[PDB]
Design an enzyme around this catalytic site. Structure first.
Site, PDB file in Angstrom:
ATOM      1  N   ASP A 108      37.202  63.341  61.811  1.00 21.32           N
ATOM      2  CA  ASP A 108      37.888  62.636  62.930  1.00 21.32           C
ATOM      3  C   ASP A 108      37.048  62.922  64.126  1.00 21.32           C
ATOM      4  O   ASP A 108      36.450  63.992  64.258  1.00 21.32           O
ATOM      5  CB  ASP A 108      39.376  63.014  63.099  1.00 21.32           C
ATOM      6  CG  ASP A 108      40.187  62.196  64.064  1.00 21.32           C
ATOM      7  OD1 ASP A 108      40.984  62.791  64.850  1.00 21.32           O
ATOM      8  OD2 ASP A 108      39.888  60.961  64.099  1.00 21.32           O
ATOM      9  N   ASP A 125      46.665  61.580  61.027  1.00 20.36           N
ATOM     10  CA  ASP A 125      46.336  60.358  61.762  1.00 20.36           C
ATOM     11  C   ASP A 125      46.708  59.085  61.072  1.00 20.36           C
ATOM     12  O   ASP A 125      46.724  58.051  61.680  1.00 20.36           O
ATOM     13  CB  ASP A 125      44.850  60.119  62.039  1.00 20.36           C
ATOM     14  CG  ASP A 125      44.369  61.203  63.043  1.00 20.36           C
ATOM     15  OD1 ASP A 125      45.184  61.979  63.639  1.00 20.36           O
ATOM     16  OD2 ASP A 125      43.091  61.359  63.156  1.00 20.36           O
ATOM     17  N   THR A 162      38.638  56.698  67.386  1.00 21.64           N
ATOM     18  CA  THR A 162      38.027  57.771  68.077  1.00 21.64           C
ATOM     19  C   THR A 162      36.697  58.112  67.456  1.00 21.64           C
ATOM     20  O   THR A 162      35.890  58.668  68.178  1.00 21.64           O
ATOM     21  CB  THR A 162      38.871  59.045  67.922  1.00 21.64           C
ATOM     22  OG1 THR A 162      39.415  59.270  66.535  1.00 21.64           O
ATOM     23  CG2 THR A 162      40.157  58.918  68.751  1.00 21.64           C
ATOM     24  N   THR A 163      36.496  57.653  66.229  1.00 29.63           N
ATOM     25  CA  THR A 163      35.198  57.652  65.581  1.00 29.63           C
ATOM     26  C   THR A 163      34.336  56.556  66.311  1.00 29.63           C
ATOM     27  O   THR A 163      33.128  56.631  66.405  1.00 29.63           O
ATOM     28  CB  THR A 163      35.255  57.492  64.039  1.00 29.63           C
ATOM     29  OG1 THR A 163      35.670  56.202  63.581  1.00 29.63           O
ATOM     30  CG2 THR A 163      36.157  58.596  63.361  1.00 29.63           C
TER      31      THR A 163
END
Lengths: 512, 510, 514
Positions: C48, C382, C81-82
């Site tokens: 992540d 997530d 978020t990657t």
């Protein structure tokens, strides 16, 4: 955490071995070349065999540690041949070292060490002559010619025959071990070096002279022996101390009361039965008063080891209290005689009821004569003791090793590939031990080795190198007679020690 | 970097090159291992002894690496150590071999992620053809030859000199007390070293073996439940000393009287509660001994840490510090307590007879404790290979004889599928070839000769090679019919975990 | 000691540029897993973008800034978020080329403002309504988990995640903030994830098999101790005399006795039969003596449970948490329809499931207790935040960089505000977006230009959000496969990227500070 790996890593391990193999290189006779090894504790050290000092060394390689460990294994079993094991193992690996570079890294090596070792042992045992103790000999006369073998090497003239027949008498009587521990040889200053005395029992080297030492009795016909690991003197029980003063009699009283406690200690054991008091801790001046006056014998300042031999043979036992103790902590003899020989006062306990120590007493009256006699008599007692246990006797001198090297040269022809090479290194390694005998006798070592192989191709006899004469000839017909068994042990231990080091070549170390 | 943040020690050049070269160095200790070998690796660690092993678990834990790629596989090897015995070495060499082959792929212009994908595929096809390589299996577990053939492979991997005696011995001493069909215990079998005597003089004893000498009388009752105490004696009262000898003379009288009356009570409490064998790791005084002769309790002089440990796991015991009288709560499943000398040393023998929770001991006799540490690796792996939890263990050819079979099937299969996946599938075949290479290196000849001549004989499912002269030149030996067999389960977890380990570590770049 | 003007902008672009490398090999399922030993030396397995920034040691101001804004995105969506980093990097790159030729930072910024408004309105057009059915939740669930773990283990976690959200409709929350209890089980494989409806308890009874199936469970969750041994205490410390401490030991033990007795009276009052069981969960010990007595009555009593178990029970079961026992009616105590004890691994976990009035579901992850079991924990984490968004928005688009090419195409063609000042930032904005699709192709081993011309053309002809089939790295329709993205993912990359860019772009000095 360290890790090291490789073909140069293997080469490292062998190189370490050579360094320890050099420490012990020669010690077979009394020539080589020494350097006094004095420790950081402020002690000076030498030994009579070079494997002793080697045990003390701490090696920083684990591979080198294996070769240390097999030394400890040999020393405990036979008590001889300890040196020999280092030399063979190391040397084997030396001729293998450049072979590893070429391709002899593979684990196949271990298999070859087994074939060579298994044949060779069997050839000794078969060639060796099995001889009774009553074949056509006395038990003492077989072991006379074997005891001479150590005695001839150094450095004691014609008295060597006489001493030999003497040294045997002690060993037969005790026999039940392969170690010299329960025998020993005690030097004595002064007296005749043209005869020595075999005493059955124990003796003490010296007891210091005290106030009325000749006013104490020196002879008893039923001495009952008190073994004391304690002492009484002015510093063990006081005889000086503070007192209140308001009359003269206070002063008298304190010294009086103290003399009583010290007098109790000998009395309580004397009434059990004692009349002989033996102690390895000092006895003073105040101490010896009571004894001298009682006409009861005392002894202080006798060696710690010697007092412990006295326990076994007379059936006495250690004490730590001399007050109010049984009479079954006492041992007896039938003869106590004190004869001053040379400058030192000599206590002889003999007539011992179970006689689990007998010991040769060697009188010379020097330091020069006596240390070389003792050195030879230490190894004499090893040859004769082990001749009772294995009754197969073979030629020494490295004569038999030269025959194994012959035998294995033959074998290398039908044995294949990578193993053959390993066998040729075994054969070359066997010749190292006799090369040093050639260095000691005073010859050209390589010239000599080759002449013995000739008579192992022209008769298969017993030709080897003598240090027991300092010449070259048959060793069986020179009465260099030592058991089969020393040689059996030394081969198998040398292979075992070897296989481990060449196998490791990947060392993981932690300095944690 | 370009950043004074974002810490990595791997990534870019260093993921592709440096990680692989490190895996390669760990797995060099297992390209001298697995099956026929004469290798020995000495490792020290200040354990007051030399530690000789040809097992992956002890080598790996000693050796620390500062990179996640090399460190991660050690865990996969431990995982296969719990579920099964020998093949631990095979797990690490495989992952490490595959990773060398991988880096070559990366070089050509192939991407990381497809290569990662093609292994999962190859692992699935290899397992699917794996129970079709069963050639032999047990049916009875009370029969010494069928069990010993299995055992043999574990032992072999250690030394190729101790295969015959040991493989017989374990099966003789039992690891067949359990049904091994749902349930098996491995902390109720230990390997117990007895110093003294040769290693062919290693013996069978049933139930708990403790080296320490027996004192006093010995029991033979069935009311004997074990009570374990680390230290139940130290003197019941400790001295202080005011004349720097004793504090003092009238007081010394009381210190001894109070010890003898408190120890009477303690040792009588043990007697009454039904504890008729007490294990003392403390010190046996005369006073304590004098009491236990009267009550009729077998007394065990001393214990060390190692001896205490096996009592707490097997018994359901606790080792309490004591100087104030206790009572049973350690309990025990052991009825009988007998006395028998092993090694010419008085050994305490515990036994009861049952299937589940039943105890056995492979006990050894050896010259030194070092020689016994390697033998121990052979034996403990031989208990852990027994665990399969069936009685038909579906034995597949041991010794690396399966390896070439797997490799041939996989290379053909690779050809059939298209895309970039296939190259990884082919590499997956040549990773199995690692095992035939290591056996060749110790045997004394090159890799080219063995792999080709195993391939030449086609489908066989027997072919593997030894340390011999037969192992070199024609490079053909039968390791189906030499009774060199391993279990299906041991090879399964070895291949499975190794493929999982190789994929996760090839992903890293942080 | 100052980096001013060109020197100040130079520092930011250089950093973004090295970072981008790392977090493209985390992008989508074709990205690669990462571990840290560079954060502290211990072994973490994480995949992540936000999380990986925290675990490392970040000293660089530009890396740190990106990590801070990251934190907000990670809470809401936990996906994208990657992606955050990738779009930031390219966005800067575009700007740099113009500046070096000769361009002011401020004109760049203006055209960003214009860029952002148009880009957000495009989301609104292009959004496709979906249902709120299971099938449609499966596809938000599977693609998000696929980001954070493999494809194999992700498909197992897909089932667990989706049943929970259906149950949360029953409570009538439009959010998730409960049913997120992640509990770990001891196992020898990780290819199982089990759903447990109610709660799970870390430890069970110290005495096995009291009544390990409870038909009718009346849960008293307590937390006063029924074990406090034989220790000599006074106020919990030593006191000067023996005797004073002892006197308290009697009264304390006596207090415990009466409380154990209240369990015996409570079973008759609530139960009355052994045709019903009785559940106790104590977060503190219970004597071995007390368990035997309770057990024959047909009571299961649990010892050494946690404070987290207790709060969860009180919500789900309808239970109470009391500092006393006493004689309480079943009206106060919660009820669970079923209790079963499942022993697996080296620790046995008592399940208390089919609760009445639930609001907590437990997703029970089995694993070996390696870092792999922590890896599925943060994947699962997530994936819950992902399917939460699907409930938030009404509309979920097909992804895999499908959305992003469509939005970039719309900008290139016309000026969104009709001025040249805006236009200079607008080019820059459009090419920044293209990183996300092209790079899935790059990981796979398929040239990046070839997918851009194709993917974009097929948009033009059709009106389909055609996406990337990850594995080939070639285009395919992202809708059918199930590679989808929420409204919230594509909104939050857009907002984070603009705000973060314009504060680094507009540096003119970086001067050190104590």
């Amino acid at each position: 955490t360290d890790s090291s790996q490789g073909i140069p890593q293997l080469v490292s391990n062998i190189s370490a071995c050579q360094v320890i193999a050099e420490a012990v290189r020669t010690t077979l006779g009394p020539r080589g070349m020494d350097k006094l090894i004095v420790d950081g504790r402020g002690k000076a050290t030498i030994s009579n065999d070079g494997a002793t000092i080697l045990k003390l060394l701490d090696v920083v390689h684990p591979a080198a540690k294996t070769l240390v460990d097999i030394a400890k294994s040999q020393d405990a079993e036979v008590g001889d041949g300890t040196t020999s094991v280092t030399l063979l193992a190391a040397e084997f690996l030396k001729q293998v070292k450049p072979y590893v570079e070429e391709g002899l890294h593979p684990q196949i090596i271990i298999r070859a060490f087994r074939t060579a070792t298994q044949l060779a042992v069997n050839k000794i045992k078969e060639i060796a002559v099995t001889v009774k103790k009553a074949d056509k000999v006395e038990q003492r006369k077989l072991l006379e010619k074997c005891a001479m073998t150590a005695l001839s090497s150094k450095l004691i003239s014609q008295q060597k025959a006489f001493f030999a027949k003497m040294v045997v008498d002690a060993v037969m009587m005790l026999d039940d071990l392969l170690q010299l521990k329960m025998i020993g040889i005690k030097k004595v200053q002064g007296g005749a070096l043209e005869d020595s005395q075999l005493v059955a029992g124990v003796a003490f080297k010296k007891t210091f002279s005290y106030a009325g030492f000749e006013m104490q009795p020196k002879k008893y016909h039923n001495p009952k022996i008190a073994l004391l690991n304690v002492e009484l003197e002015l510093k063990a029980e006081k005889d000086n101390a503070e007192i209140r003063v308001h009359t003269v009699e206070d002063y008298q009283a304190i010294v009086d009361a103290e003399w009583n406690i010290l007098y109790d200690k000998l009395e309580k054991i004397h009434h059990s039965g004692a009349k002989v008091v033996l102690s390895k801790l000092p006895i003073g001046d105040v101490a010896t008063q009571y004894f001298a006056d009682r006409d009861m014998f005392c002894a202080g300042r006798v060696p710690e080891e010697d007092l412990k031999r006295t326990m076994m043979a007379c059936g006495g036992s250690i004490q730590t209290s001399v007050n109010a103790l049984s009479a079954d902590v006492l041992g007896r003899c039938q003869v106590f005689e004190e004869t001053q020989i040379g400058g030192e006062r000599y206590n002889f306990f003999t007539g011992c009821p179970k006689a689990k120590t007998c010991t040769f007493i060697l009188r010379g009256g020097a330091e020069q004569f006596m240390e070389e006699t003792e050195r030879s008599l230490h190894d004499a007692i090893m040859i004769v003791r082990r001749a009772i246990k294995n009754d197969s006797v073979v030629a020494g001198g490295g004569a038999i090793e030269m025959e194994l090297s012959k035998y294995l040269r033959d074998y290398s022809r039908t044995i294949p590939g990578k193993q053959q090479l390993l066998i040729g290194a075994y054969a070359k390694a066997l010749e190292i031990i006799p090369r040093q005998l050639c260095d000691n006798a005073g010859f050209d070592a390589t010239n000599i080795l080759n002449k013995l192989r000739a008579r192992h191709a022209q008769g298969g006899t017993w030709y080897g190198v003598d240090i027991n004469n300092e010449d070259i000839a048959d060793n069986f017909e020179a009465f260099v007679w030592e058991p089969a068994m020393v040689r059996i042990n030394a081969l198998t231990a040398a292979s075992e020690a070897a296989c481990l080091i060449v196998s490791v070549d990947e060392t993981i170390k932690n300095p944690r | 970097m370009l950043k004074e943040g974002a810490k990595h020690f791997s990534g870019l050049e260093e993921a592709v090159y440096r990680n692989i070269q490190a895996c390669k160095e760990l797995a060099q200790t297992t390209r001298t291992a697995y099956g026929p070998n004469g290798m020995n690796k000495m490792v020290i660690n200040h354990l007051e002894k030399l530690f000789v092993t040809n097992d992956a678990a002890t080598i790996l834990r000693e050796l620390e690496v500062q990179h996640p790629a090399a460190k991660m596989i050690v865990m996969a090897s431990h995982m296969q150590e719990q579920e099964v015995g020998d093949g631990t070495n095979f797990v690490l060499v495989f992952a490490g071999a595959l990773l060398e082959l991988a880096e070559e792929l990366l070089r050509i212009g192939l991407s990381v992620s497809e290569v990662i994908e093609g292994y999962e595929i190859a692992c699935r096809k290899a397992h699917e053809i794996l129970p079709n390589l069963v050639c032999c299996s047990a049916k009875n577990l009370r029969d010494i030859d069928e069990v010993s053939s299995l055992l043999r492979t574990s032992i072999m991997s250690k030394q190729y000199g101790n295969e015959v005696f040991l493989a017989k011995l374990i099966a003789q001493a039992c690891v067949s007390i359990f049904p091994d069909s749902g349930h098996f215990n491995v902390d109720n079998i230990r390997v117990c070293k007895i110093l003294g005597s040769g290693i062919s003089s290693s013996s069978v004893l049933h139930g708990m073996v403790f080296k320490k000498e027996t004192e006093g009388d010995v029991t033979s009752v069935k009311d004997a439940k074990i009570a374990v105490y680390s230290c139940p004696f130290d003197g019941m009262i400790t001295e202080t000393k005011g004349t720097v000898l004793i504090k003092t003379a009238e007081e010394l009288m009381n210190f001894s009287k109070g010890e003898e009356n408190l120890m009477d009570a303690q040792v009588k409490a043990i007697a009454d509660t039904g504890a008729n064998v007490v294990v003392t790791g403390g010190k046996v005084a005369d006073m304590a001994l004098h009491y236990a002769n009267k009550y009729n309790i077998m007394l065990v002089r001393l214990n060390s840490k190692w001896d205490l440990r096996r009592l707490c796991k097997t018994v359901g015991a606790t080792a309490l510090p004591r100087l104030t009288p206790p009572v049973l709560e350690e309990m025990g499943h052991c009825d009988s307590v007998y006395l028998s000398e092993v090694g010419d040393t008085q050994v305490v023998v515990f036994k009861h007879e049952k299937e589940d929770g039943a105890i056995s001991t492979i006990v050894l006799r050896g010259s030194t404790d070092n020689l016994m540490d390697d033998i121990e690796r052979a034996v403990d792996d031989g208990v852990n290979t027994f665990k399969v939890l069936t009685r038909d263990k579906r034995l597949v050819p041991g010794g690396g004889a399966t390896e070439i079979e797997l490799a041939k099937q996989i290379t053909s299969y690779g050809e059939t599928c298209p895309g970039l996946e296939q190259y990884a599938i082919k590499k997956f075949a040549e990773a199995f070839e690692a095992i035939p290479r290591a056996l060749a290196e110790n045997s004394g000849v090159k890799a080219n000769e063995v792999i080709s001549k195993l391939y030449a004989v086609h489908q066989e499912g027997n072919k593997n090679v030894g340390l011999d002269i037969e192992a070199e030149v024609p490079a053909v030996k039968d390791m189906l019919e030499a009774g060199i067999l391993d279990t299906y389960l041991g090879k399964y977890w070895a291949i499975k975990l190794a493929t999982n380990a190789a994929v996760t570590v090839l992903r890293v770049d942080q | 000691e100052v980096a001013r003007a060109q020197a100040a902008l130079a520092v930011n672009i250089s950093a973004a540029r090295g970072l981008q490398d790392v977090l493209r090999t985390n992008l989508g399922p074709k990205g690669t897993m990462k571990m840290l030993v560079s954060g502290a030396g211990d072994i973490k397995l994480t995949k992540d973008g936000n999380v990986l920034l925290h675990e490392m040691q970040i000293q660089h101001p530009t890396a740190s800034l990106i990590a801070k804004v990251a934190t907000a995105q990670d809470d809401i969506t936990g996906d994208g978020t990657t992606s955050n980093v990738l779009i930031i990097g390219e966005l800067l790159k575009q700007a740099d080329l113009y500046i070096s030729e000769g361009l002011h930072p401020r004109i760049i910024t203006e055209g960003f403002e214009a860029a952002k408004e148009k880009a957000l309105q495009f989301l609104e057009e292009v959004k496709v309504s979906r249902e709120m059915d299971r099938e449609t939740l499966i596809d938000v669930a599977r693609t998000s988990l696929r980001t954070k773990v493999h494809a194999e283990l992700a498909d197992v976690l897909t089932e667990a995640v989706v049943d929970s959200i259906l149950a949360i409709k029953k409570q009538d929350e439009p959010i998730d903030l409960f049913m997120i209890e992640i509990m770990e089980m001891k196992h020898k494989s990780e290819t199982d994830t089990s759903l447990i409806r109610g709660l799970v308890l870390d430890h069970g009874a110290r005495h096995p098999d009291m009544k390990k199936r409870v038909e009718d469970a009346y849960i008293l969750t307590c937390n006063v101790s029924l074990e406090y041994e034989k220790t000599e205490v006074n106020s919990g410390f030593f006191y000067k005399s023996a005797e004073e401490r002892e006197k308290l030991v009697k009264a304390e033990r006596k207090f415990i006795e009466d409380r154990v007795k209240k369990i015996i009276e409570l079973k008759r009052k609530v139960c009355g039969d052994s045709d019903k069981g009785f559940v106790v969960i104590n977060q503190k010990g219970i004597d071995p003596f007390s368990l035997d007595a309770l057990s024959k009555e047909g009571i299961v009593a649990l010892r050494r449970a946690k404070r987290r178990n207790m709060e969860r029970l009180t919500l789900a079961c309808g239970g109470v948490a009391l500092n006393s026992f006493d004689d309480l009616s079943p009206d106060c105590l919660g009820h669970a329809g079923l209790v079963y004890e499942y022993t697996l691994g080296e620790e046995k976990f008592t399940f208390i499931e089919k609760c009445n009035n639930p609001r907590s579901v437990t997703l029970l992850i089995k694993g070996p207790n390696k870092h792999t079991l922590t890896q599925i924990k943060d994947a699962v984490r997530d994936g819950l935040r992902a399917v939460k968004n699907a409930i938030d928005d009404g509309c979920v688009v097909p992804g895999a960089g499908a959305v992003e090419v469509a939005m970039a195409e719309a900008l290139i063609k016309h000026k969104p505000s009709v001025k040249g000042r805006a236009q200079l930032g607008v080019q820059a904005f459009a090419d920044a977006l293209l990183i996300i699709p092209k790079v899935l192709a790059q990981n796979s081993g398929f040239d990046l230009q070839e997918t851009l011309v194709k993917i974009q053309a097929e948009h033009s002809e059709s009106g389909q959000l055609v996406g990337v089939d990850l594995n080939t790295g070639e285009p395919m329709v992202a809708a059918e496969v199930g590679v989808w993205d929420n409204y919230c993912v594509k909104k939050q990359l857009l907002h984070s990227c603009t705000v973060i860019a314009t504060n680094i772009l507009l540096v003119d000095e970086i001067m050190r500070a104590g």
